Structure 1
Amino acid sequence: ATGPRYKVPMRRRREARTDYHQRLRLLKSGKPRLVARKSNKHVRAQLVTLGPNGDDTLASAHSSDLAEYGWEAPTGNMPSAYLTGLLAGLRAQEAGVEEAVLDIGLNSPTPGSKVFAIQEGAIDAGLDIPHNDDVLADWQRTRGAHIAEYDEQLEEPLYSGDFDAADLPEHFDELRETLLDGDIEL
C-alpha cells in the first residue's frame, strides 16, 4: 500500500476469516477437519480434506436443509447445531470418512457452545473425533430445554407465530431419531 517495502497480509487474514496459526496446528493431525461454522440464523458443519489447489469438502450439513427431514423450528440454536453435526457426521460416514479434528474457526472455545454441540452430533454419527466430554452441553440444553423453560416465563410466545407456543425439545428427539436410520442423502 505505502511503498514497495510494504507487507500485505494474506488475503484470508485481511478478510479476518482464517487464523493461520491455528490452521497449521490443525493440519498437523493429518486428519480431516470438522469445520464448525455459524451465522445469525444458521449453522454449518463441513468435513474438509487438504487439496493440491485448496481444501476439498467431502461431506457437509447446513441447519437449513434440516427441515428437509422434518425440522419445523428456528435454526440458530443448540438443538439445531447438534443435528447439523449429526447430519454432516452421517453423510461423512457415507463418504468413507471415519475420524476428524474440530476446527472451530475464529469462534471461542466456550463450554456448552454450539460448535461443541456440532462436535457432539458428528461424534454420535459415528465419526471419531478427539474431544472432551465435560466441555460439552448437558444433553438437556442440547435437546433445547433451556429454551423451553425460557418460554415458560412466557406471557408472550418466544416464537413469533412459528410452531408451538411452549416449544418442543421432543421435536428434537423425533428428528435425531429419524436421522439414525435409512432416509435419503444419508
Structure 2
Amino acid sequence: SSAYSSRFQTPFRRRREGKTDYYQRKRLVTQHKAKYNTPKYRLVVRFTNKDIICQIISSTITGDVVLAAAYSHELPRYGITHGLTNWAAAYATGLLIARRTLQRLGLDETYKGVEEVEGEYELTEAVEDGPRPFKVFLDIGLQRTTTGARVFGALKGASDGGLYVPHSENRFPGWDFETEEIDPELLRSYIFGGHVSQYMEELADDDEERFSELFKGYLADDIDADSLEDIYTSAHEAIRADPAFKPTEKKFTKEQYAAESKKYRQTKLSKEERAARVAAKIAALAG
C-alpha cells in the first residue's frame, strides 16, 4: 500500500525482535569483562506468560552459557501446584530456582558455606551476604523497573538466602514515600503473600477445589494455607532442599515418546520427538 525501491541499506540483528544486544548485554557482560581476567557473570530471570524463567546464565563463548538453571515452570512437583508466577515464586524460583538451587558449585560453596537461606525468612534487610560467590549480578532483561514487581523480586527472594546479586532496598516490593523501609510488607508478599488478603473478596468464584484446597486458603486471616503452603514449600532449597534440576525429569526425555501423529506438518516435528529422535529434522531437514 505504498513503496520500497532502493531500500538497500539496513539491517539490525536478531534483536530486531527484542533482546537488547543494547547497552544491555554489553554492559553486564562488561565490565567483567577485563581489568582481569577471563571469566565472570552473573544471572538473570525474565518471566514468561505462564512459566517464570530464572535461567542463571553467565556470559561468553561462542555464545553465553548456563551456570545452571532455575525457572519455576514446575515449582509444582516440588511443592506448590497452584499460583504459577505468584510474585513469591519469585522468592521461590528465587532461592528455589538458582540461588541455592545454584548449584553444584554452588550447593557446594553452600549447604555449609554461604548458605544462609534465608537463615531467616523474617524478613527485612539486607539481605546481602558475607562469603562469597557465585556473586551473580541481576540483569533483569527488558521489563520496566517498577518499584515492587516480579523481576526485582526474583532478586529479593532469591538472594534473601544466597548469592551476592547486590540487590538494594529502594525498589524491593513495597515500602517507600519518603524514605525506607518498610519491613512488614516484604515479609508479607515474600511469604506468598498478600494475594491471601486479596483472597478476601466475596462474591463470584475464584479458583476451584484449588479454591477448596485453598479458600483456607489461610483465612482465618492468612497463616494456614497461604503463608503455609508457602512457609513449607516456600522453603524449597533450604527446607524441601532439592536439586535445582531438581528431579531433572528427564521425564522430559520420557515424554518423547509423546507427539501423537503424524508428519506433521513440516513433518520434521514428527520423527523429531519420536523417541528423542527418529529421522532428520534438526539433522537432515533443517538447520
Shorter-chain TM band: 0.7 to 0.9
Structure 1 letter corresponding to 2:159: I
3-state SS of 1:174 partner: helix
Residue 47 of structure 2 is matched in structure 1 by: 38
Task: Flag the 1:93–1:133 CA change in 2: closer, same or farther, 3 A.
Answer: farther
Shift of 1:145: 3.0
Number of aligned residue pairs: 185
TM-score by length of 1: 0.87
Residue 94 of structure 1 is matched in structure 2 by: 104
Shift of 1:166: 4.3
Tell whether the 8 Å contact from 2:53 to 2:70 is kept in structure 1 after alignment.
yes
1:63-97, Cα deviation, whole Å (9 max, x unpaired): 12211211122202112121001121113243345
Residue 121 of structure 2 is matched in structure 1 by: none
Give the % identical residues: 29
Matched, 1:153 2:163: no
Shift of 1:4: 7.8
CA distance in 2, matches of 1:134, 1:169: 24
CA distance in 2, matches of 1:140, 1:164: 18
Structure 2 letter corresponding to 1:180: A
Shift of 1:54: 0.3
Task: Flag the 1:68–1:29 CA change in 2: closer, same or farther, 3 A.
Answer: farther
**Which protein is bigger by CA-based radius of gyration?**
2
The Cα RMSD (Å) is: 2.2
CA distance in 2, matches of 1:160, 1:2: 58
Matched, 1:74 2:124: no
TM-score by length of 2: 0.58
CA distance in 1, matches of 2:23, 2:216: 44
Residue 164 of structure 1 is matched in structure 2 by: 214
Structure with greater proportional helix content: 1
Where structure 1 has 5 or more consecutive residues not aligned to the other structure, the ranges are none
Tell whether the 8 Å contact from 1:59 to 1:95 is kept in structure 2 after alignment.
no
3-state SS of 2:11 partner: coil
Residue 10 of structure 2 is matched in structure 1 by: 7
Residue 136 of structure 1 is matched in structure 2 by: 172
Shift of 1:98: 1.3
Matched, 1:51 2:99: no
Greater mean alpha carbon deviation, residues 76-85 or residues 13-22: 13-22
Where structure 2 has 5 or more consecutive residues not aligned to the other structure, the ranges are 33-39, 107-132, 174-185, 218-225, 245-287
User: Which structure 1 residue ranges, 4+ long, deviate > 4 Å from structure 2?
Assistant: 1-5
